[PDB]
Design a protein around this ligand. Structure first.
Ligand SMILES: Cc1cc2nc3c(=O)[nH]c(=O)nc-3n(C[C@H](O)[C@H](O)[C@H](O)COP(=O)(O)OP(=O)(O)OC[C@H]3O[C@@H](n4cnc5c(N)ncnc54)[C@H](O)[C@@H]3O)c2cc1C
Ligand SMILES: Cc1cc2nc3c(=O)[nH]c(=O)nc-3n(C[C@H](O)[C@H](O)[C@H](O)COP(=O)(O)OP(=O)(O)OC[C@H]3O[C@@H](n4cnc5c(N)ncnc54)[C@H](O)[C@@H]3O)c2cc1C
Lengths: 434, 436
């Protein structure tokens, strides 16, 4: 064998696993399909901006541990956690109110929608602590549950906006239990949830953290080297790529679950990987940055995934400077809006911010990038209880890792780091046992 | 030089630092004065397994929770403090008892007033001086100073006194108000999460199991029962003198409790912050003990102010109830008030809180008189945060410093030790790599 460990995928999961493995003394190679590391995090420059994963918080043990580990610093996005004005669409009409006034409505709705989170996920990092209680509800979509609640249509519409934002899809495709999971990870507190999901970002960019972790390790890296076949025998794994064939005692498959079909495995992978590679998680929407000429202040908008007025489930202020306001925008379906068509985005903004002039608009297409085939991972109904454990399971000398199968903040950067660290430790232990 | 890194102290901070450094390829030696690793964590047996020091953890604690998951460890629950059935409390020399919810009405109203400014002082609890000016304005207050300015009943004030004395492990006028604020801010500004964070979850296999996993993931030599006496540094090396040998390294990580700083002779002498903290000490100076009573008392939680005429204990709560009766955890603000290892004295002291209990067993480790700790967990006195934290953390030549006593976040906790040790170990690895 040429290597002790080969890691397929150079996202945070694969990089963290490679650090764990190499620092334990194992000869490790990273094979990365793109011409860059980072995967679904991508720090670039527009005119330095984050084209993918962005926000972090100290409710996320691993990513915060690493940030402090390397002396990085964080800045604030203002719009979601501390807006001045809240705009929301209900029954195809647009309402606007002081943030406190809007959050009365939205928070009462939340009190209703999250009432069972404590019963389902008392230990958010131990998914199956309440296996029976979770199994009883895992068949519910976010919409299925919403419609059972005693709320006004307005409350339901705000919750629709919120849940569609969380799952990055229409609410009937997103698992209700996953919504509960987010709430429980935020210490069963709505303010803590807002602070955790869209407020703090690494001052020097996610790439700086990724690089600190890589420098802390001792792994070889081959970029622009897509893996095509993985063959496993009793002694080794043979990983075939477009640019060479490599052998290792153990291989950590750290690719997006939505891409599992894209490699030929012998033996074939278990039915859980096959089923999730077929169905995919729910993350399949649009995220974009919009520069507007006007100074609109700190706004937060809510619109149902399906409404007659705007394609955006939410838009909010990132920051306001001399050039106007930078907004972050989410939509549940790229069929609704071309986030890179400036005139289309401007039109889509008119009902929420009448009169805004779009100076610029950009969004990376994670859905059609063959190396992601989607955005951040949120399970569809039934997927947690059916597949999580089966997804994590090692198969022979093949190990599996990623936020897409993390126990806690699955779907976040923190999930990638947590899962990669544990899986790398397991791989090192396995090799020591032999 | 004999080593790249010598780590003085085999607590969680030093153990984490030693892992960080050795896994970076550096030849690392740990020197530990006691005959064991763990420092102020000590997993022992009381009639066959108890934690005599650091015990409770939570996922609001990034480093220790990261490590717990890293190694696949599990947690159990202490029931008494976070989910009692009955709360007993002492106010104005009276003892009241009520269903937990009723007691928490009073205690929670008091808390709502006492913590109202935490958000303004520590918006980023892991970044101590983010709001430096606001913190400097209040850092001169003791917990008692602030309490007496509040619009509360004497009952509310007495419950708050109990709580603040429990947190600081000392009398409330010795504890910094800002430190109380920090605990609240680290608990995400909500009392339920604070209760869950400070006394609820414990590692099923004991703190030593995590300490051992960290050590096994590393590659460092260990010398136990080898107290350091002198540390001398020049431009090229550090010479560390112990009772059992002399060792040299390019860099030395000093990971001892600040309360012990005076006990090693440093040449050149250390900066004024280290000396001032070794003189003044943090506030942690109380009693912690395990008590077995024959009776099944249920899940109780008690509150008594640090100075009261009824009992020496600031709080007692149920750890668990099994066939042998009730195991309770007891805290006192002053070792002069109760001999935690005198069974009859403890039984007497418990009578007003749990009238009729028969004490079958009682044990508490004396961290105050142990020369290797000289105190319990670190909570700063007034002024100490803003005057000393940064200078305490400062590297001096080839000397680096680490410990829970100087962490940015959960300072005073296991999480703080792991966090600070990781940062300092990474800094040492960087420094030594640069020299090559
Ligand atoms: C639009 C968007 C916004 C987000 N915002 C946030 C946020 O604010 N906060 C947050 O915490 N998270 C956010 N996330 C989620 C976060 O970015 C990801 O969950 C995390 O980066 C996933 O890391 P990973 O290592 O598990 O997988 P990935 O990052 O997807 O890494 C997988 C890697 O494998 C490579 N690969 C795939 N197939 C092959 C192959 N055959 N051969 C070789 N290499 C291959 C890919 O190129 C990629 O480099 C966001 C995600 C999206 C899509
Ligand atoms: C009673 C009590 C209860 C606690 N409960 C909790 C809890 O529930 N949860 C929590 O998170 N934290 C708790 N803590 C705090 C926690 O135990 C400590 O904060 C943490 O262990 C600090 O570790 P450290 O590595 O920074 O220093 P320490 O663990 O104190 O160890 C420093 C080491 O230096 C060694 N040393 C000292 N002098 C010398 C010398 N001259 N030569 C060589 N070695 C030397 C010591 O022997 C020791 O091993 C508690 C503390 C106490 C006292």
């Amino acid at each position: 064998v040429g290597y002790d460990v080969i890691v397929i995928g150079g996202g945070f999961a694969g990089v963290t696993a490679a650090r764990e493995a190499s620092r334990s003394g194992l000869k490790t190679l990273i094979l990365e399909g793109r011409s860059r590391l980072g995967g679904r995090t991508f720090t670039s420059k527009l005119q330095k901006v984050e084209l993918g994963g962005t926000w972090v918080h100290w409710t996320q043990p691993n990513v915060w541990t690493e940030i402090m580990h390397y002396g990085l610093e964080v800045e604030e996005t203002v719009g979601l956690a501390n807006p001045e004005t809240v705009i929301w669409v209900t029954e195809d009409n647009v309402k606007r109110a002081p943030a406190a006034e809007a959050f009365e409505i939205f928070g009462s709705a939340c009190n209703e929608y999250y009432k069972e989170a404590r019963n389902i996920y008392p230990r958010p990092f131990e998914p199956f602590f309440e296996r029976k209680k979770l199994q009883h509800v895992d068949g519910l979509s976010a919409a299925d549950y919403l419609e059972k609640l005693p709320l006004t249509r307005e409350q339901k519409d705000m919750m629709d906006s919120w849940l569609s934002g969380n799952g990055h899809n229409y609410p009937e495709t997103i698992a209700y239990s996953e919504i509960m999971r987010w709430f429980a990870l935020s210490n069963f507190n709505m303010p803590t949830m807002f602070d955790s999901i869209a407020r703090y970002k690494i001052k020097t960019g996610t790439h700086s953290l990724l690089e600190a972790i890589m420098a802390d390790g001792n792994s070889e890296v081959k970029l622009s080297t897509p893996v095509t076949k993985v063959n496993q025998d009793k002694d080794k794994v043979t990983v075939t790529t477009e640019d060479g064939v490599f052998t290792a005692s153990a291989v950590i498959v750290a690719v997006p679950i939505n891409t599992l079909h894209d490699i030929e495995y012998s033996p074939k992978l278990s039915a859980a990987k096959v089923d999730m590679g077929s169905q995919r998680h729910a993350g399949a929407g649009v995220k974009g940055y919009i520069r507007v000429k006007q100074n609109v202040g700190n706004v937060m908008t809510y619109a149902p995934a399906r409404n007659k007025l705007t394609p955006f489930t939410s838009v909010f202020t990132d920051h306001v400077d001399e050039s106007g306001t930078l907004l972050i925008a989410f939509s549940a379906d790229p069929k609704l809006i071309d986030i890179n068509d400036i005139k289309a985005v401007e039109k889509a903004l008119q009902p929420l911010l009448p009169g805004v002039e779009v100076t610029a608009s950009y969004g990376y297409d994670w859905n059609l990038d063959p190396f992601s085939k989607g955005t951040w991972c949120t399970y569809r109904p039934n997927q947690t209880t059916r597949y999580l454990t089966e997804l994590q399971k090692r198969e022979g000398r093949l190990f599996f890792a990623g936020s897409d199968m993390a126990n806690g903040w699955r779907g976040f950067i923190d999930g990638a780091i947590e899962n990669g660290r544990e899986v790398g430790h397991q791989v090192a232990t396995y090799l020591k046992r032999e």
